[PDB]
UniProtKB/TrEMBL annotation, chains A, B, C, D:
Stated family: Belongs to the potassium channel family. H (Eag) (TC 1.A.1.20) subfamily. Kv11.1/KCNH2 sub-subfamily.
Localization of this protein: Cell membrane
Residues annotated as domain Cyclic nucleotide-binding: 310-410
Assembly, per entry: The potassium channel is probably composed of a homo- or heterotetrameric complex of pore-forming alpha subunits that can associate with modulating beta subunits. Interacts with DNAJB12 and DNAJB14; chaperones DNAJB12 and DNAJB14 promote tetramerization. Heteromultimer with KCNH6/ERG2 and KCNH7/ERG3. Interacts with ALG10B. Forms a stable complex with KCNE1 or KCNE2, and that this heteromultimerization regulates Inward rectifier potassium channel activity. Interacts with CANX. The core-glycosylated, but not the fully glycosylated form interacts with RNF207.
Name of the protein this chain belongs to: Voltage-gated inwardly rectifying potassium channel KCNH2
Parent-protein residues present: 398 to 863 of 1159
Transmembrane residue ranges: 15-35, 123-149, 207-231
Domain of life: Eukaryota
Length: 431, 431, 431, 431
């Protein structure tokens, strides 16, 4: 019969609790210093539905360190005892039995909503909103204290001055002005502007003004600190880019690096940063553990999977392995690559874009949409030149495999080995 | 007969010294500018127990660079000579012989308590408390100077104004107001609020006001700096989390990564951060040197140690080695793992949670509480399929060993080799 | 017939749009609160050439996610629909049909120029300029609001005071002063100075003053944050240097390191930082991918390329490989190096500067401008002493090759192998 | 006959130039706004010795990009032409031919001393001093401008008020007050305090006040930024320590790690941080290149060098190699180490402190001051137990060598091989 903690009714009740705690923390001091009808009825019903709230909290489940969800509300009751339930019960104790400073349950209400603050937090802007709200609350409380001192002093205080400036000599100013100027002065000394209209005269309010000045210093410092933290948290990525560019620049100017090579170097730098944004995908790929690593590497194989006929007959373990074994090589359009007379151990398949192969003005293999070039592997097995030089074109996203890696991964399973060698499709074997 | 330095009586004496230095640094200027009875007796007894203090310091031990504790108080005396003992002796010299500016020993008292400041420091909040205290002290001294200038000017100064606002025209205001307004004004120009009630009129106090404004600028900047440093020191961990998530997000959106695979990737990300909190435990494990490394790796072996019968007969060196050789593999509930037709060199034991093994809808080995599966090792020694696919369940905390590592670590000691192969317990050998 | 987006005429039009939006956002409120002729003609022509602007935007090309440049202006039109074109069309709708608050199209103009803000940004100083500009705009708007409240209150407000201080009792002050003091007061509460000349008296302007104080707090915090971010972004490189120096110092006085060794260590440290500036060139060299890596490593080979006769006959692949295989070794003047009786596998060529070779006061090989020393390789192949010790001189930039690396890279191609061994030029083979 | 640039006379001349530029930049405006005798003689002699200065600069050497020191002052002259020499010559042109704003050469003097600012910089405190100095200069200039406006307005400005407050009604205040209040007001609006004694009344000084407020905002922000940068630059090391401790703590509480082992872990952590301070010495050891690396590693060999008799006959290359081959192992007092039944390939010598060897309550080898234990190497060559367990004592700074490393480094030179095996001193070979 017990309700669960994440029930939406509980959340709506929590929002109503927040509204009511704000209401009481705002109206109790303002009525306590400055100040029949159903307002007392509302005040008592506040305590009543907070008693209802503790009843619900015993009814609804809680989250323990061991058990996130547990039944048997008696356990919830014994967990709440000697803790926040004592606070919320003091908040649920009527104190009607004037003397308004005994309404300290309202501050316990704010303590328990501060217990709910972490749930309320989603991003950094909400933090700024909460800081502004507590700024306003501190201001209102200090204004109530200031008005209380002003009343006590009058039997030369700021009240007589106020009677003089806004013309109501003493009569007396209305309760509207008698609070607006209080709040005005509380900000006048909290954000450190300090106007000359209202200013302390006798001793007590000078002591109070010292206290307000110190509080303002502290909290204004806190606001600066948080705002600076956020702004730096974004200019951190900004500075990452700037330091990357600076290191590149330092290398370039250190070794002279005449105009052609340099310009290719920097243009490649912005080309890289355009998509990698400084962070390499290789490191984060290695961070993900084995099986997930293969799976995310398997997603990149929507290119050679379906277009290679032998690949279809392969077993899924072979798919995963031979998939992780590939290297999809990015290169910006307009690159020259492996020459003739080099090693042939760097086996190459075609993955994306299009490239042309110029061996002494002999352009061949103008393909590039999931095609294949390279060397035979059974008999040749000889490093050297395949056909000759390659020539630059549009997107040079090629497909690196190794001549030792492919063999070691392939020879463990001879059935797909044979099925692979039988359907040896090469769009243009450069010989 | 000598006392040692860390005696509690010495610490209590140090606290009393702190109380007395605060007392003197507060009351000497206030009596010097604004101002029979035992107060002179108290002032002289101050010097007396500071002489007692230097006597104790010669009696009690000190900490040298070479010897932390040394006897023979003569060595302590020769070490103190020409140094802080000269300062504390000047502080222990009576200057009774008005002229109150000669009481410069009080500032040396503050210098020597600043020597004790590092001991007083425990965390960052104490730093803020000390900054607030020195703020108050600077304020009090500047207020005393301000009152002195005010007295000198009166033969138009702020004193006559003060006589005019709080009604005591000249008579004259009481010594209570004649100091409260001084402190009020000193804050008025130190936290940069600048009220209009009291303000410099003649030339001398305008020069003084310039000096106060500059001092306030400097120290207010210092307070902002420290508070910002602390707040950034916490949002550092915040930003670490945010940049980790950002790199993950960038990888995800770079390579498309359709909804199923992506959602598993991020959910695994929060699962990891839930307990690792960004920092990998592997790095800190490798940081700890060899023997401690094995010992802390030995603590993780409360799982396979007592439940493996052959393990009990093993020698402790074998325990340490074979313990460091394991890899306790974390995996969140709901993971698929090594298939059939793969390599068998990845030997696997059961460490925590529970998992099920589905080879073509054939679920076997539903164990998982410190159990064992895998392949025989003596005769088989062949990569391939063991039984087939595994199926996802609750906590997938498995137990990686290697087929080359275990052999190389085990074959160095044939007695436990034989005892191990004899008691070859496997809860379900997947064949 | 369509114009392209990057046409200079479009950029000049954008600059004119910026000028006109500034003009309107400045003059519309000032005329709306404080305030025949062609000014209405100018105001309407503003809307007219903004209609012209949307016509051009449909005519000129745009940049899509897939296509950077696309023809067929109908596509541009359908892309603009339901988006920024609605905003710019509301800005292009005349509202002549007093009531000046309906001119909300001017704020949409500022929104769309904020869309162009990223293009306007080049560095950080422009950011500070834009922040100052928006500061001025906020000030002007708040001054207009303040003047409006002042007019409303007059049927004790600040207007009567203004009539009293600058002598024009009521008559009334000219519209020049009636605005200069407004702006004066708006800064008086925005940068938190708070003069006493003009200050709120009745209730409405006290509420307004509270609002201004809060806005000033926020934006002043923002300015501090940005400036601190930039200054820290430079002292970051400063602190990098300092932390390198500190680590060096830590190592120095941990291990004593008497004066000769210490001094050579720090002098080498400053020598290194003089040109490497902390960042190693090795890391950035490895960062650049293969082909570019070789090409930039090939640029360093303007030293041994043209002066080695066998090198000329070599094939370009051999050039690239044997070029990447070298290590140009930096060493400051005044270094001692490999002794006799050591290994000879560290083959050494001469790259820059000059050095002396002293084997028992026998100085030989006073060369160093692209010269060669070392050992024979065909028959000798023996570790040991070559001739003996070296002697320090000016720039010790030597040329490391390996005795296994050179062979493995050279033996793959026997034609240049033979051509190399035939022209075996060694300026002084130390035997 | 030419003087060199680093001559001390040149430095003394530079200091005199600094004094004179400060003098002129201070007195020229104060004479120009507020204000026979040799002061004109001094003013002209200023230009005279600045002409002398440019004469010296042509005489003395300069530093070029290629040549740090070069003779032939004609080259210095042609280098100075069309550059800073034009500025210094304009500064060396007399403008006597009132109008005091034409003395713009004084600002060029400040520009050229700003060229010398980098030389003046040694640390961060000098930066703060220079910022304070330029703060004072900006204040003085703004005060001169303010006084000029005040004079112009008088034919209700602040001058009449000043005549009223300090009693000198108009007569008029002395030139002392007529400047002290100017500086007072310039700070009143620059550090954002804003007193009420002096305040703008007519339009001109309100515009000026707006400008001053903006300048104060900017420069006050700059001061905050720099101070925060320095304070963060120290709390950076603070935060390094804190994050190290945090990672250690997270590992500790993640894996439970019961009290004995945990306590050993943190006590070792503090012991490490006591001397390494987070900075690992291995990294900086590997950072220093080869020869210097061996030399600084050779300094650690004042322990086994002189006490090993065979070591003396060794060749210096063997010294260097066998020295770099060692590992001086730090361990805090109270550690247990390699047991029996383990591998013997970890050869161990005694380096520092003292340790005891307990094999079944059989304590042997109580040495430790540059002594030797271990196993024979010629015939034994068998992993296993040497004698048995070791027992904890004071400083466990032991001496790691390897059984493969020592052989491979030793067998390249058989003469010291034989001399080593002949004088095979082992203080206690644990058998």
């Amino acid at each position: 019969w017990t309700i669960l903690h994440y029930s939406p009714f509980k959340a709506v009740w929590d929002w109503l609790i927040l509204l009511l705690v704000i209401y009481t923390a705002v109206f109790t001091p303002y009525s306590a210093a400055f100040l029949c009808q159903p307002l007392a009825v509302v005040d008592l019903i506040v305590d009543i539905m907070f008693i209802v709230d503790i009843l619900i909290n015993f009814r609804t489940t809680y989250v323990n360190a061991n058990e996130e969800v547990v039944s048997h509300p008696g356990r919830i009751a014994v967990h709440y005892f000697k803790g926040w339930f004592l606070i919320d019960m003091v908040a649920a104790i009527p104190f009607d039995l004037l003397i308004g400073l005994l309404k300290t349950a309202r501050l316990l209400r704010l303590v328990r909503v501060a217990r709910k603050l972490d749930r309320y937090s989603e991003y950094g802007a909400a933090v700024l909103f909460l800081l502004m709200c507590t700024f306003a609350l501190i201001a209102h409380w200090l204004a109530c204290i200031w008005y209380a001192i002003g009343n006590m002093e009058q039997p030369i205080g700021w009240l007589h001055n106020l009677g003089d400036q806004i013309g109501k000599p003493y009569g007396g100013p209305s309760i509207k002005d008698k609070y607006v100027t209080a709040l005005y002065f509380t900000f006048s000394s909290l954000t450190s502007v300090g106007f000359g209209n209202v200013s302390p005269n006798t001793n007590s309010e000078k002591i109070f003004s010292i206290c307000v000045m110190l509080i303002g210093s502290l909290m204004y410092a806190s606001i600066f600190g948080n705002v600076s933290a956020i702004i730096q948290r974004l200019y951190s990525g900004t500075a990452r880019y700037h330091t990357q560019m600076l290191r590149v620049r330092e290398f370039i100017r250190f070794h002279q690096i005449p105009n052609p090579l340099r310009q290719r170097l920097e243009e490649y730098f912005q080309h890289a940063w355009s998509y990698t944004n400084g962070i390499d995908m290789n490191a984060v790929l290695k961070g993900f553990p084995e099986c997930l690593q293969a799976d995310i590497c398997l997603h990149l194989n929507r290119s050679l999977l379906q277009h290679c006929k032998p690949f279809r007959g392969a077993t899924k373990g072979c798919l995963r392995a031979l998939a992780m074994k590939f290297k999809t090589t990015h290169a910006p359009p307009g690159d020259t690559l492996v020459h003739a007379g080099d090693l042939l151990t760097a086996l190459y398949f075609i993955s994306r874009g299009s490239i042309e192969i110029l061996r002494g003005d002999v352009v061949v293999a103008i393909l590039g949409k999931n095609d294949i070039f390279g060397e035979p592997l059974n008999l040749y097995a000889r490093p050297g030149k395949s056909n000759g030089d390659v020539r630059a074109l549009t997107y040079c996203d090629l497909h690196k495999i190794h001549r030792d890696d492919l063999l070691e991964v392939l020879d463990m399973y001879p059935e797909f080995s044979d099925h692979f060698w039988s359907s040896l499709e090469i769009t243009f074997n450069l010989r």
